[PDB]
Each structure stands twice: as structure tokens, then as C-alpha cells.
Amino acid sequence: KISQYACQRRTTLNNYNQLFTDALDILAENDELRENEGSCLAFMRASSVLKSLPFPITSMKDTEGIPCLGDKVKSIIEGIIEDGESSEAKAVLNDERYKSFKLFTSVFGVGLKTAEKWFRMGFRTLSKIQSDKSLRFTQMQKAGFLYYEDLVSCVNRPEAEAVSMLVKEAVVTFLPDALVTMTGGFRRGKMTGHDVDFLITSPEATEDEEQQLLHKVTDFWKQQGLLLYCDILESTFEKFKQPDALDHFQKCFLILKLDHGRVHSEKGKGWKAIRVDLVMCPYDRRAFALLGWTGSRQFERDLRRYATHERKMMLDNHALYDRTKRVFLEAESEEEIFAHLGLDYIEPWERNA
Numbered sequence: 001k002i003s004q005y006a007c008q009r010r011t012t013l014n015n016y017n018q019l020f021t022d023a024l025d026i027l028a029e030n031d032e033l034r035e036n037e038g039s040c041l042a043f044m045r046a047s048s049v050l051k052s053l054p055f056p057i058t059s060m061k062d063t064e065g066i067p068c069l070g071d072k073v074k075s076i077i078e079g080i081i082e083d084g085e086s087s088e089a090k091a092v093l094n095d096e097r098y099k100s101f102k103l104f105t106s107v108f109g110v111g112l113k114t115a116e117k118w119f120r121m122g123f124r125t126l127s128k129i130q131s132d133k134s135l136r137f138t139q140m141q142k143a144g145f146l147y148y149e150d151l152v153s154c155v156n157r158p159e160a161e162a163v164s165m166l167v168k169e170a171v172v173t174f175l176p177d178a179l180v181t182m183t184g185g186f187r188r189g190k191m192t193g194h195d196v197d198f199l200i201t202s203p204e205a206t207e208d209e210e211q212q213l214l215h216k217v218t219d220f221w222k223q224q225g226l227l228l229y230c231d232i233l234e235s236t237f238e239k240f241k242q243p244d245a246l247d248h249f250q251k252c253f254l255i256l257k258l259d260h261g262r263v264h265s266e267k268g269k270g271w272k273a274i275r276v277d278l279v280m281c282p283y284d285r286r287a288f289a290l291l292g293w294t295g296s297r298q299f300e301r302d303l304r305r306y307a308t309h310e311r312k313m314m315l316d317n318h319a320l321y322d323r324t325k326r327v328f329l330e331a332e333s334e335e336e337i338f339a340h341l342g343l344d345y346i347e348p349w350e351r352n353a
């Protein structure tokens with residue numbers, strides 16, 4: 001019996017149902033853009049469960065016993081079985097609002113509000129937005145437009161590893177005992193990503209040393225002429241608060257200049273702009289941060305839902321709290337968090353939910 005929770009399923013990059021999941025992912029994305037959170041969630045859960053299957057769906061009988069497959073989702077599956085296409089997903093791909101929202105939000109610094117504003121002003125292309133003399137852009141959007149082609153090109157593993165070298169080199173200059181771990185999609189085994197994420201922690205650094213590292217590292221890169229964009233969010237983390245966007249570790253959203261000579265791959269300007277996110281956490285919370293920043297987004301949503309609805313526990317990126325025992329549960333590894341929750345350990349490459 002397949003569980004309704006992604007944290008109780010093994011989801012590897014071996015997807016046998018991409019014909020169904022690509023359609024469900026488009027319908028979920030459109031519902032996100034149309035601010036229909038409920039319908040978005042239903043399509044995301046259905047797409048997630050199909051991604052976990054060890055076989056391709058070839059008839060409606062194959063869907064019997066599979067959870068998170070409502071009547072609307074089953075109608076979409078039935079239509080794809082019929083002629084290999086989703087008429088619903090095809091209509092979304094051709095919708096002018098969907099196309100504009102995908103195109104505008106593909107710019108670093110442009111969210112739902114700005115995309116909607118530009119669409120209602122009558123804009124349909126990035127060329128017409130960029131050349132407009134009345135529009136005002138944020139510093140994030142300026143960088144988003146200036147390095148657009150590099151940021152819309154996917155980051156591959158040789159590039160991610162070249163970025164890892166730069167991060168490690170900079171960090172150990174100021175904190176030589178620091179541990180730097182690549183998180184996100186690349187930690188789950190992905191060949192490509194939109195950015196490169198890292199978790200930084202130090203077993204001996206003080207509260208102030210921990211605070212100053214991201215400032216020292218980014219100033220070093222600014223001096224080297226490698227810092228193309230930088231936004232540092234100070235920590236809002238509270239050591240003794242109970243475990244959605246307001247509480248967080250110190251982090252920074254960057255754009256780094258990656259020289260081609262640093263990339264060791266089999267293969268213009270001689271450099272590429274790369275989106276990099278750095279997260280600094282206290283040493284004792286490193287397992288919770290690692291689990292949260294490894295993802296996938298759906299795996300994280302189901303982990304938190306399972307903890308709350310099944311084990312009356314409260315989980316987030318900073319801690320695990322037991323509401324029955326009225327105590328915070330400690331962990332030195334992800335394995336210990338899974339054991340506290342009563343879950344079999346799911347490897348990072350099996351969290352592609």
C-alpha cells in the first residue's frame with residue numbers, strides 16, 4: 001500500500017510517468033499563477049505520487065489503490081491514455097496569461113505581483129519591458145535583466161562544483177573549521193539546477209563570528225570583482241522558539257562571476273553568471289537545516305504534514321518539538337530526525353517528490 005505522504009515513499013530521478021507528471025506539473029503551475037492554492041496542491045500531490053511508481057500507467061485499472069488521485073486528476077490521466085496528450089495542459093501552454101507569467105517571473109527579481117502589473121499594462125515580451133522609459137526596476141530586477149541569458153541557462157554539475165570550490169576557498173579563509181555542504185537539487189542527484197545552494201556551519205565559531213562570515217566572504221568576492229549581486233538577510237532565528245517565511249537562518253542571495261577556466265567539464269565572454277544561495281546555521285541545528293534545504297519542496301511539505309497530523313510533532317528547518325512530551329528533540333544527523341518521527345530513512349536521491 002503506497003502512502004499518501006512523500007516522506008513515506010522513495011522518489012528517484014527514474015520517472016516512468018513523465019507523460020502524466022509533465023501535464024500535472026503545468027496544471028499545478030497555472031493554478032499557482034492564478035492564486036488557486038487548493039487546486040495547485042491537489043495536482044502537486046498527484047504528480048508527486050506518480051513520480052514514485054516503479055512502472056508506467058498504461059490503463060485506468062493501473063490507478064486502483066494509488067492515493068491522491070481525485071476525480072479531476074483521473075479525468076486528466078484518462079485523456080492522456082486516450083491520445084498521449086493532455087487537452088487541459090495544452091490549453092494552459094497556449095494561454096496568454098500563463099505564457100506572460102512564466103516569461104516575466106523567469107527574470108530574477110520578478111514575482112507574481114510585478115508579472116500581473118506588467119500583463120495588465122499590456123506588456124507581453126521582455127524586450128518591450130526592458131526598453132520602456134516609464135518603468136522603474138528594483139536592483140534585483142536590474143541584475144535579473146543584465147544577466148538574464150546566463151541565469152535562464154541551466155547550471156550543470158561541473159559549474160556547481162566550480163562554485164563549491166569558490167565558496168569553500170572563501171569561507172575557510174575566515175573560518176578554517178567550517179563545514180560547507182551543497183544542498184538543494186544537486187544533493188538529490190540532479191544533473192542541472194537554476195542555482196547552487198550551500199549550508200555553512202562551524203563547530204567552534206561564536207554567535208558574532210557566525211554572524212560576520214557571510215559579510216566577510218561577500219566583501220572578499222566584491223574586492224575580487226566576482227560579486228555581481230548580493231542581498232544578505234540577517235537571521236530571525238530564535239534558539240528557544242517553537243517550530244512560515246518570518247523565522248530563518250542568516251542567508252544571502254547572490255550572483256557570482258564564474259570564470260570558464262575554473263570549470264572542469266568535457267567542453268564567448270569567458271565567464272558565466274551563477275545564482276548562489278548561502279545559509280549559515282548554528283552547529284547544533286545543522287541536521288534540521290540540511291534536511292530542510294535538501295528538499296524537494298513536496299518532500300518538505302509532506303514531512304511537516306506527517307510530523308503534525310501523525311506524530312503530534314512540530315518540524316521546521318531549525319528544530320523538532322514533541323507536543324506530547326513537551327520537549328525539543330535533538331539530532332546530529334538526518335537519520336536521527338527520521339528515527340524520532342518513526343520513519344524509515346529516505347536517502348537524499350530518494351527525496352525527488
Ligand SMILES: Nc1ccn([C@H]2C[C@H](O)[C@@H](COP(=O)(O)OP(=O)(O)OP(=O)(O)O)O2)c(=O)n1
Pocket residue numbers: 183184185186190192193194195197292293294295296297300317
Ligand atoms: N525559504 C526557503 C528556501 C529554500 N528552501 C529549500 C527547500 C528546497 O528544495 C530548496 C529551495 O530553493 P531551490 O528552489 O534552489 O531548491 P532546488 O535546488 O531544489 O531547486 P532547482 O533544482 O529547481 O534549481 O531549498 C527552504 O526550505 N526554504
Ligand SMILES: [Zn+2]
Pocket residue numbers: 184185186193194195196197
Ligand atoms: Zn537549487
Ligand SMILES: [Zn+2]
Pocket residue numbers: 184195196197277
Ligand atoms: Zn536556492
Ligand SMILES: [Zn+2]
Pocket residue numbers: 242243247248316317318319
Ligand atoms: Zn523555525
Ligand SMILES: [Zn+2]
Pocket residue numbers: 264265
Ligand atoms: Zn579538468
